[PDB]
């Protein structure tokens, strides 16, 4: 079955291969020969595909994985929770996009979703993850990362194909430290988890943007960018409110309350983690 499909014959001429298995809810890739983690950017970390299916047997793995690298030709799509039950595409974007995007298609290990894999190069304005309202998504790579593979094709599309991608641009939104100070908040008790019920969720707002006032030097912008991307933001924080929205009068109460700040001369704080 899966050793007759062309797209497999095609990428087995590469030794790019590795295995995984589901740990928590992400999929973890291995080295197939010594049953290692495996980087994705290690080239000695891959074995070829005689190699993953053997160590695939000998570790109990759950399947096979293809690393994308920047010299081969291969391009990543994956279309996240598009299928029905019945393995049917239920998202109107991902139904045009496999009728402009002819190429080799795959269903997802989890049963909803497509891998399609294309030979050619991403446009260079577009955003590696577009997620859409109904809980679909759309990623786009070609290296840095691997693959899945399942050799459960879709319909009948069991070759990869040569296509220019710029009409990827229909379907993916458009582009033209934070992460730094949130690593640093996180790894000194000071990121939030997620409200539970019973939590007066506005006043975890209040304690979080006074902790984000300290460690972001008062930066408003930055406080706001950094807010969206933790547990306790909601539609609320973009609410209006008096002269402005909900979240914009936390974060400048926060400004006004807080007095001291983190300034990378390495200071320390008011608020315990
Ligand atoms: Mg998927
Ligand atoms: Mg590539």
Redesign the pocket.
């Known amino acids: 079955m899966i050793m007759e499909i062309p797209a497999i014959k095609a990428l087995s001429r590469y030794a790019q291969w590795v295995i995984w298995k589901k740990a928590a809810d992400t999929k973890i890739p291995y080295n197939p020969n010594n049953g290692k983690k495996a980087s994705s950017t290690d080239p000695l970390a891959w074995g070829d595909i005689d190699e993953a299916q053997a160590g695939l047997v000998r570790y109990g793995a759950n399947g096979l994985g293809f690393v994308?690298?920047?010299s081969?030709?291969?391009?990543f799509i994956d279309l996240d929770h598009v299928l029905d039950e019945n393995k049917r595409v239920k998202c109107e974007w991902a139904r045009q996009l496999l009728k402009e995007i002819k190429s080799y298609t795959e269903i997802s290990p989890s049963g909803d979703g497509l891998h399609v894999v294309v030979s050619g190069k991403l446009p260079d304005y577009i955003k590696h993850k577009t997620k859409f309202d109904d809980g679909s998504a759309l990623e786009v790579y070609?290296?840095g990362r691997y693959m899945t593979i399942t050799g459960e094709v879709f319909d009948g599309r069991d070759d990869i194909k040569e296509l220019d991608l710029s009409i990827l641009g229909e379907f993916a939104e458009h582009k033209i430290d934070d992460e730094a100070i949130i690593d640093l908040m996180k790894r000194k008790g000071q990121w939030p988890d997620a409200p539970a019920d019973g939590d007066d969720w506005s006043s975890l707002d209040m304690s979080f943007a006074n902790r984000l006032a300290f460690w972001c030097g008062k930066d408003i912008e930055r406080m706001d960018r950094i807010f969206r991307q933790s547990p306790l933001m909601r539609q609320k924080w973009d609410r209006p409110t008096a002269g402005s929205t909900y979240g914009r009068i936390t974060l400048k109460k926060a400004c006004d309350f807080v007095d001291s700040v983190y300034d990378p001369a390495l200071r320390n704080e008011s608020d315990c983690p």
């Open positions: 994308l690298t920047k081969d030709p291969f391009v070609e290296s």
